[PDB]
Amino acid sequence: DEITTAWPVNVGPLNPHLATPNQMFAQSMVYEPLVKYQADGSVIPWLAKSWTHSEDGKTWTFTLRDDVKFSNGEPFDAEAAAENFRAVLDNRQAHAALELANQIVDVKALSKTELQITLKSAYYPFLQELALPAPFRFIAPSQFKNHETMNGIKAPIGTGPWILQESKLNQYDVFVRNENYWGEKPAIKKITFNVIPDPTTRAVAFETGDIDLLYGNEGLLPLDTFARFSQNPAYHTQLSQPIETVMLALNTAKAPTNELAVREALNYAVNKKSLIDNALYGTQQVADTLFAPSVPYANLGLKPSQYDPQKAKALLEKAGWTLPAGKDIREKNGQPLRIELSFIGTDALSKSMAEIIQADMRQIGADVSLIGEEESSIYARQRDGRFGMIFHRTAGAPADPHAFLSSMRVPSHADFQAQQGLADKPLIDKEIGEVLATHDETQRQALYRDILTRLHDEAVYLPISYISMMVVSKPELGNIPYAPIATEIPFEQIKP
Ligand code: NI
Numbered sequence: 001d002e003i004t005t006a007w008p009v010n011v012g013p014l015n016p017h018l019a020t021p022n023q024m025f026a027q028s029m030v031y032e033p034l035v036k037y038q039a040d041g042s043v044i045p046w047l048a049k050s051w052t053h054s055e056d057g058k059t060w061t062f063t064l065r066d067d068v069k070f071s072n073g074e075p076f077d078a079e080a081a082a083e084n085f086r087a088v089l090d091n092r093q094a095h096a097a098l099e100l101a102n103q104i105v106d107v108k109a110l111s112k113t114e115l116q117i118t119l120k121s122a123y124y125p126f127l128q129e130l131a132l133p134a135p136f137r138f139i140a141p142s143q144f145k146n147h148e149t150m151n152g153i154k155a156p157i158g159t160g161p162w163i164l165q166e167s168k169l170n171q172y173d174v175f176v177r178n179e180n181y182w183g184e185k186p187a188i189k190k191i192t193f194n195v196i197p198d199p200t201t202r203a204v205a206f207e208t209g210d211i212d213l214l215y216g217n218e219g220l221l222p223l224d225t226f227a228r229f230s231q232n233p234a235y236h237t238q239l240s241q242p243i244e245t246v247m248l249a250l251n252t253a254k255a256p257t258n259e260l261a262v263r264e265a266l267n268y269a270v271n272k273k274s275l276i277d278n279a280l281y282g283t284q285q286v287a288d289t290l291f292a293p294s295v296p297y298a299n300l301g302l303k304p305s306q307y308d309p310q311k312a313k314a315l316l317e318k319a320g321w322t323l324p325a326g327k328d329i330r331e332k333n334g335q336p337l338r339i340e341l342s343f344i345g346t347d348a349l350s351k352s353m354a355e356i357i358q359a360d361m362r363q364i365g366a367d368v369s370l371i372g373e374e375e376s377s378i379y380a381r382q383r384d385g386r387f388g389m390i391f392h393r394t395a396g397a398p399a400d401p402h403a404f405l406s407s408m409r410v411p412s413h414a415d416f417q418a419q420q421g422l423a424d425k426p427l428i429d430k431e432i433g434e435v436l437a438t439h440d441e442t443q444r445q446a447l448y449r450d451i452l453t454r455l456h457d458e459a460v461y462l463p464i465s466y467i468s469m470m471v472v473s474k475p476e477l478g479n480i481p482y483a484p485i486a487t488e489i490p491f492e493q494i495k496p
Pocket of ligand 1 (some may be wrong): 439
């Protein structure tokens with residue numbers, strides 16, 4: 001009834017409203033949302049049994065379960081929920097990347113079971129954002145520090161199935177089953193996280209000792225390690241459905257990526273399978289489209305641009321980018337075909353992919369110049385449009401497609417800047433505005449198809465690969481089912 005894993009760090013304090021990336025897995029073990037995301041893109045009842053919205057889409061009224069207790073035995077009710085929203089909104093700035101935190105105007109408990117949330121605008125993807133691991137999940141208000149969470153908490157008391165019982169710093173965290181959980185309790189009663197900061201040391205600890213499984217993204221489970229494990233029949237390995245897309249964003253307003261033919265050429269010139277086999281140790285899927293077809297609203301049958309250097313070269317040639325005698329880089333009006341790829345210098349994987357991409361483009365006569373900078377400078381370039389090409393990712397999980405599309409129409413964002421050279425940019429932005437505000441599902445799919453097709457046809461992006469969540473486990477443990485939000489390891493499905 002017990003399992004052991006490993007993690008690079010202790011996760012305390014596990015504040016639901018100041019969650020760090022290394023805490024995001026633990027967050028979901030302890031803290032729960034009003035509504036629960038499903039693979040089909042919808043949300044279903046969870047702590048809220050049901051909900052209604054006003055006709056203008058700005059008032060949302062949630063009817064809550066009446067049988068839920070925080071793990072310390074205090075009731076979950078509308079007042080406790082409203083207190084959490086207040087605590088989050090008191091720190092509104094820290095959450096401004098999440099449109100919901102910007103959208104909420106008022107939260108009011110109408111009764112013990114009725115929670116009303118008022119938004120600035122119709123924003124129907126509201127529900128998908130409530131389903132995120134953070135920040136709109138619930139800690140017992142008794143555990144606030146002086147009536148806030150932004151300045152810290154007391155005990156990490158959620159409604160969830162697991163309780164963080166003990167830490168021994170730099171040694172282990174221990175989660176135990178909440179015996180008073182409102183829902184489906186795990187068969188497992190204890191999960192111990194040995195704190196093993198070095199990923200090679202973690203991997204050896206799995207191979208040798210009584211650690212039952214490891215899981216995570218690239219930062220937690222190195223891609224080369226996972227490839228090795230996936231080869232070895234002594235271990236079980238699994239890869240989730242696609243989460244994020246990794247791509248280049250091409251600046252449609254800056255020469256030479258202002259030319260459709262150049263962007264199309266770039267899309268045909270990258271050998272994605274080889275890049276993945278090499279830099280990513282064959283662990284990810286090739287991305288032909290901005291969103292994987294498993295992404296809600298994105299199963300569009302868009303035409304892939306398959307790796308074809310001959311076609312890439314023909315596109316450049318027709319566009320006037322030709323090789324002079326005795327030269328290996330194309331020129332047009334005496335100007336070489338040069339494209340800057342700016343990336344975060346300290347990011348090893350970005351650097352590895354940039355080098356591969358540079359080499360691919362040499363084969364078609366294009367000079368990709370690599371510029372590694374501080375993250376702070378790359379951030380400013382993205383806001384400003386001071387880039388030729390940049391690495392970029394979607395968010396996956398329940399935020400996409402809506403969140404990623406929403407930012408395309410807002411100034412000071414990479415995707416807005418990248419798209420400035422498109423003749424249909426105003427139509428795209430209007431349609432994104434409409435898709436976010438539409439209550440009609442038919443109109444929603446028609447609009448998503450139009451926006452994504454336009455962006456695909458105009459070759460704004462150079463999709464490279466889809467990132468999956470990795471799990472490696474001892475054979476005796478069993479397969480673990482993936483959850484709709486891949487970080488939410490479904491520990492209740494583990495059967496002793
Ligand atoms: Ni409705």
